[PDB]
Enzyme design. Structure first.
Site: not given
Ligand SMILES: C[N+](C)(C)CCOP(=O)(O)O
Length: 258
Positions: A11, A124
């Site tokens: 992020y 997470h």
């Molecule tokens: C987890 N999220 C949906 C917030 C972001 C996207 O993650 P990812 O699908 O690239 O692993």
């Protein structure tokens, strides 16, 4: 810290903007606006309701909830940069608050929220911390309140292949089965625990997003690079493959305090 890991990798500001390109304006959660509409379709709230959004991201979820119901919405996200972005997207609305904080240490009163909502954020957290979080959620909910979650899940670890193991490791996710997740909610004393394996619907959402990416490639390349395109394209391709075969799963959970 975990905060630093998230802000400096998955992020970063650019990472968030790339996600927003494919998920949709104000979203970094699966299916953007359209999934939000569907997930909230059977939820009832009003102008007097209080909502907590755990992992509020770019704020689209809270914006939608406040628009649809007039509810007070409070989003918490550990990433300071993402909260700064979200706060640039709303003004003059005293019923939407975004706060950078660790939900695992944040204090809220018992019996506070009508809805605790979370979209693809709890992945997470370590297993220990998922349990700790849901215990806190139970306390924070009003007696009449609802917990409503989507989250990345998986088949049993013994079944993972090399590519999926490496994805989970690199992301530092803790992905459990839909069934294990429901059991945590039950162990926290939530009632009416409904879990749905929405992997098929998630696959549909991913396909819509993937098609959008492909059709808007030129604009993506102007905003970001070819390297980032390839990474995003391949990432969605794997999610589509792995959801089709239920290796990577998408769980939906709804439960009540009483
Ligand atoms: C987890 N999220 C949906 C917030 C972001 C996207 O993650 P990812 O699908 O690239 O692993």
């Amino acid at each position: 810290s975990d905060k630093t890991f998230l802000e400096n990798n998955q992020y970063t500001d650019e990472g968030v903007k790339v996600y927003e390109f494919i998920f949709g304006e104000n979203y970094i959660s699966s299916g953007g606006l359209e999934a939000t509409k569907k997930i909230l379709s059977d939820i009832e709230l009003n102008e007097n309701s209080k909502v907590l959004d755990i992992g509020s991201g770019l704020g689209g979820g809270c914006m939608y909830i406040n628009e649809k119901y007039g509810a007070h919405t409070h989003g918490i996200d550990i990433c300071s940069n993402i909260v700064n972005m979200a706060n640039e997207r709303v003004s003059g609305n005293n019923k939407i608050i975004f706060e950078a904080n660790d939900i695992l240490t944040k204090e809220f009163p018992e019996n506070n929220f009508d809805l605790i909502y979370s979209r693809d954020a709890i992945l997470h957290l370590s297993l220990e911390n998922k349990n700790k979080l849901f215990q806190k959620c139970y306390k924070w909910l009003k007696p009449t309140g609802t917990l409503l979650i989507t989250d990345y899940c998986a088949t049993e670890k013994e079944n993972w292949d090399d590519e999926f193991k490496e994805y989970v490791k690199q992301r530092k996710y803790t992905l459990i089965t839909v069934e294990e997740y429901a059991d945590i909610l039950t162990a926290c004393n939530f009632k009416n625990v409904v879990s749905k394996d929405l992997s098929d619907y998630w696959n549909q959402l991913l396909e819509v997003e993937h098609k959008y990416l492909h059709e808007n490639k030129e604009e993506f390349l102007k905003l970001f690079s070819e390297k980032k395109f390839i990474s995003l394209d391949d990432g969605w391709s794997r999610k589509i493959k792995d959801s089709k075969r239920k290796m990577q799963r998408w769980g939906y959970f709804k439960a009540t305090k009483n």
